[PDB]
Design an enzyme around this catalytic site. Structure first.
Site, PDB file in Angstrom:
ATOM      1  N   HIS A   1     -42.053  30.168 -30.159  1.00  0.00           N
ATOM      2  CA  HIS A   1     -43.287  29.555 -30.661  1.00  0.00           C
ATOM      3  C   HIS A   1     -43.534  29.883 -32.122  1.00  0.00           C
ATOM      4  CE1 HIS A   1     -45.419  33.438 -29.587  1.00  0.00           C
ATOM      5  NE2 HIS A   1     -46.194  33.086 -30.605  1.00  0.00           N
TER       6      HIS A   1
ATOM      7  N   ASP B   1     -39.475  31.701 -24.288  1.00  0.00           N
ATOM      8  CA  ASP B   1     -40.100  31.799 -25.605  1.00  0.00           C
ATOM      9  C   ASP B   1     -39.287  32.685 -26.535  1.00  0.00           C
ATOM     10  OD1 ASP B   1     -41.897  31.257 -27.649  1.00  0.00           O
ATOM     11  OD2 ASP B   1     -43.426  32.713 -26.932  1.00  0.00           O
TER      12      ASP B   1
ATOM     13  N   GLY C   1     -50.021  37.630 -34.897  1.00  0.00           N
ATOM     14  CA  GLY C   1     -48.972  37.821 -35.872  1.00  0.00           C
ATOM     15  C   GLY C   1     -47.970  38.902 -35.528  1.00  0.00           C
TER      16      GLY C   1
ATOM     17  N   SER D   1     -46.216  38.778 -32.397  1.00  0.00           N
ATOM     18  CA  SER D   1     -45.161  38.252 -31.526  1.00  0.00           C
ATOM     19  C   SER D   1     -43.808  38.456 -32.195  1.00  0.00           C
ATOM     20  CB  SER D   1     -45.395  36.770 -31.198  1.00  0.00           C
ATOM     21  OG  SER D   1     -45.172  35.951 -32.311  1.00  0.00           O
TER      22      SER D   1
HETATM   23  C1  LIG Z   1     -54.879  32.051 -19.602  1.00  0.00           C
HETATM   24  O1  LIG Z   1     -53.808  31.401 -20.266  1.00  0.00           O
HETATM   25  C2  LIG Z   1     -53.153  32.249 -21.169  1.00  0.00           C
HETATM   26  O2  LIG Z   1     -53.772  32.710 -22.071  1.00  0.00           O
HETATM   27  N1  LIG Z   1     -51.728  32.555 -20.955  1.00  0.00           N
HETATM   28  C3  LIG Z   1     -51.014  33.325 -21.813  1.00  0.00           C
HETATM   29  C4  LIG Z   1     -51.214  32.808 -23.289  1.00  0.00           C
HETATM   30  O3  LIG Z   1     -50.882  31.709 -23.604  1.00  0.00           O
HETATM   31  N2  LIG Z   1     -51.878  33.676 -24.271  1.00  0.00           N
HETATM   32  C5  LIG Z   1     -52.045  33.228 -25.627  1.00  0.00           C
HETATM   33  C6  LIG Z   1     -53.270  33.863 -26.297  1.00  0.00           C
HETATM   34  C7  LIG Z   1     -53.408  33.374 -27.781  1.00  0.00           C
HETATM   35  C8  LIG Z   1     -54.583  34.141 -28.501  1.00  0.00           C
HETATM   36  C9  LIG Z   1     -54.009  35.143 -29.552  1.00  0.00           C
HETATM   37  C10 LIG Z   1     -53.034  36.134 -28.903  1.00  0.00           C
HETATM   38  C11 LIG Z   1     -52.614  37.160 -29.985  1.00  0.00           C
HETATM   39  C12 LIG Z   1     -51.330  37.492 -30.227  1.00  0.00           C
HETATM   40  C13 LIG Z   1     -50.139  36.879 -29.480  1.00  0.00           C
HETATM   41  C14 LIG Z   1     -48.777  37.595 -29.436  1.00  0.00           C
HETATM   42  C15 LIG Z   1     -48.836  36.145 -29.917  1.00  0.00           C
HETATM   43  C16 LIG Z   1     -48.785  36.068 -31.400  1.00  0.00           C
HETATM   44  O4  LIG Z   1     -49.047  36.982 -32.151  1.00  0.00           O
HETATM   45  N3  LIG Z   1     -48.325  34.835 -31.916  1.00  0.00           N
HETATM   46  S1  LIG Z   1     -48.240  34.724 -33.545  1.00  0.00           S
HETATM   47  O5  LIG Z   1     -47.307  35.702 -34.141  1.00  0.00           O
HETATM   48  O6  LIG Z   1     -49.569  34.894 -34.130  1.00  0.00           O
HETATM   49  C17 LIG Z   1     -47.745  33.011 -33.906  1.00  0.00           C
HETATM   50  C18 LIG Z   1     -48.560  31.866 -33.257  1.00  0.00           C
HETATM   51  C19 LIG Z   1     -47.151  32.769 -35.278  1.00  0.00           C
HETATM   52  C20 LIG Z   1     -46.245  32.832 -34.035  1.00  0.00           C
HETATM   53  N4  LIG Z   1     -48.446  34.957 -29.126  1.00  0.00           N
HETATM   54  C21 LIG Z   1     -49.217  33.794 -28.953  1.00  0.00           C
HETATM   55  O7  LIG Z   1     -50.221  33.622 -29.596  1.00  0.00           O
HETATM   56  C22 LIG Z   1     -48.605  32.792 -27.910  1.00  0.00           C
HETATM   57  C23 LIG Z   1     -48.275  31.587 -28.272  1.00  0.00           C
HETATM   58  C24 LIG Z   1     -48.598  30.785 -26.987  1.00  0.00           C
HETATM   59  O8  LIG Z   1     -47.930  31.230 -25.896  1.00  0.00           O
HETATM   60  C25 LIG Z   1     -46.711  30.637 -25.657  1.00  0.00           C
HETATM   61  N5  LIG Z   1     -46.274  29.553 -26.459  1.00  0.00           N
HETATM   62  C26 LIG Z   1     -44.974  28.981 -26.180  1.00  0.00           C
HETATM   63  C27 LIG Z   1     -44.108  29.542 -25.094  1.00  0.00           C
HETATM   64  N6  LIG Z   1     -44.550  30.673 -24.304  1.00  0.00           N
HETATM   65  C28 LIG Z   1     -45.843  31.226 -24.545  1.00  0.00           C
HETATM   66  C29 LIG Z   1     -46.333  32.408 -23.728  1.00  0.00           C
HETATM   67  C30 LIG Z   1     -42.711  28.952 -24.800  1.00  0.00           C
HETATM   68  C31 LIG Z   1     -42.261  27.807 -25.646  1.00  0.00           C
HETATM   69  C32 LIG Z   1     -43.138  27.227 -26.723  1.00  0.00           C
HETATM   70  O9  LIG Z   1     -42.700  26.153 -27.470  1.00  0.00           O
HETATM   71  C33 LIG Z   1     -43.525  25.825 -28.554  1.00  0.00           C
HETATM   72  C34 LIG Z   1     -44.537  27.811 -27.030  1.00  0.00           C
HETATM   73  C35 LIG Z   1     -50.067  31.241 -26.783  1.00  0.00           C
HETATM   74  N7  LIG Z   1     -49.937  32.573 -26.960  1.00  0.00           N
HETATM   75  C36 LIG Z   1     -50.810  33.632 -26.440  1.00  0.00           C
HETATM   76  O10 LIG Z   1     -50.552  34.802 -26.658  1.00  0.00           O
HETATM   77  C37 LIG Z   1     -51.387  34.865 -21.683  1.00  0.00           C
HETATM   78  C38 LIG Z   1     -50.692  35.265 -20.585  1.00  0.00           C
HETATM   79  C39 LIG Z   1     -49.279  34.401 -20.588  1.00  0.00           C
HETATM   80  C40 LIG Z   1     -49.491  33.305 -21.411  1.00  0.00           C
END
Ligand SMILES: COC(=O)NC1(C(=O)N[C@H]2CCCCC/C=C\[C@@H]3C[C@@]3(C(=O)NS(=O)(=O)C3(C)CC3)NC(=O)[C@@H]3C[C@@H](Oc4nc5c(nc4C)CC=C(OC)C5)CN3C2=O)CCCC1
Ligand SMILES: [Zn+2]
Length: 198
Positions: free
Chosen positions: A76, A100, A156, A158
């Site tokens: 992602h 992911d 930020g 991940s």
């Molecule tokens: C109730 O439902 C849910 O909440 N379910 C879940 C849930 O979605 N949570 C949310 C809460 C967000 C709010 C902020 C969370 C803070 C830090 C997060 C670590 C962190 C991050 O830092 N990113 S980042 O670096 O900023 C960035 C965006 C620059 C890269 N990642 C995130 O945001 C990820 C991104 C997205 O998730 C996924 N996108 C994809 C895939 N697989 C996942 C699981 C597979 C194939 C894809 O093709 C496109 C996409 C939402 N994300 C969450 O974390 C939670 C339980 C399982 C899934």
């Protein structure tokens, strides 16, 4: 039109999390202008060091972690993008949207973490701000923060590692569980799922 079609840039290493000594701290190695230019050319001549890199595209910033000679991050963040390197763009060696997960060959000069075989559930999440956050493992791909905090503090990070007490890689941070904006739990790609992919 086909003549008009653009190409996405590479992922670029813009800094690192220094875990060398007694104090963990983030270092920036490239500013935003140089990042934009390196993303377009894919040619990054900066020296790389360490295990956890801070990486950026034109629109996102996140982390990437070297484990067993592969620089791993989240789909992602990276999508299918190449990563910039001294000799030009490097194509992904691993891509798994279902986990992911993506990976590239680890850059020359990086240090790799060792996959954990401890079976310990007392983990440590390293963030882009060099916070070392205790996390109790709760499943194959889940752990609970011992001290919850707003999700802002995890955004930020991940692609960052969860480590065991002995400093081995247990997984790659993927997502956070938010309750009214508070992160109580995290999800991660377990290192065995990387070890399978390889
Ligand atoms: C109730 O439902 C849910 O909440 N379910 C879940 C849930 O979605 N949570 C949310 C809460 C967000 C709010 C902020 C969370 C803070 C830090 C997060 C670590 C962190 C991050 O830092 N990113 S980042 O670096 O900023 C960035 C965006 C620059 C890269 N990642 C995130 O945001 C990820 C991104 C997205 O998730 C996924 N996108 C994809 C895939 N697989 C996942 C699981 C597979 C194939 C894809 O093709 C496109 C996409 C939402 N994300 C969450 O974390 C939670 C339980 C399982 C899934
Ligand atoms: Zn271990």
């Amino acid at each position: 039109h086909m003549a008009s079609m653009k190409k996405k840039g590479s992922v670029v290493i813009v800094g690192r999390i220094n875990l060398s000594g007694d104090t963990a701290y983030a270092q920036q190695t490239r500013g935003e202008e140089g990042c934009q230019e390196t993303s377009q050319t894919g040619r990054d001549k900066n020296q790389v060091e360490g295990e956890v890199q801070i990486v950026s595209t034109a629109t996102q910033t996140f982390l990437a972690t070297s484990i067993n000679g592969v620089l791993w991050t989240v789909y992602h963040g990276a999508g299918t993008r190449t990563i910039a390197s001294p000799k030009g763009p490097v194509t992904q060696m691993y891509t798994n949207v279902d986990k992911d997960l993506v990976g590239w060959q680890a850059p020359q000069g990086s240090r790799s973490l060792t996959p954990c075989t401890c079976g310990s559930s007392d983990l440590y999440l390293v963030t882009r701000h060099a916070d070392v956050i205790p996390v109790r493992r709760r499943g194959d791909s889940r752990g609970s923060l011992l001290s919850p905090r707003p999700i802002s503090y995890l955004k930020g990070s991940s692609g960052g590692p969860l480590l065991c007490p002995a400093g081995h890689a247990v997984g790659i941070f993927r997502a956070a569980v938010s309750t009214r904006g508070v992160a109580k739990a995290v999800a991660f790609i377990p290192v065995e799922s990387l070890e399978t992919t390889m």
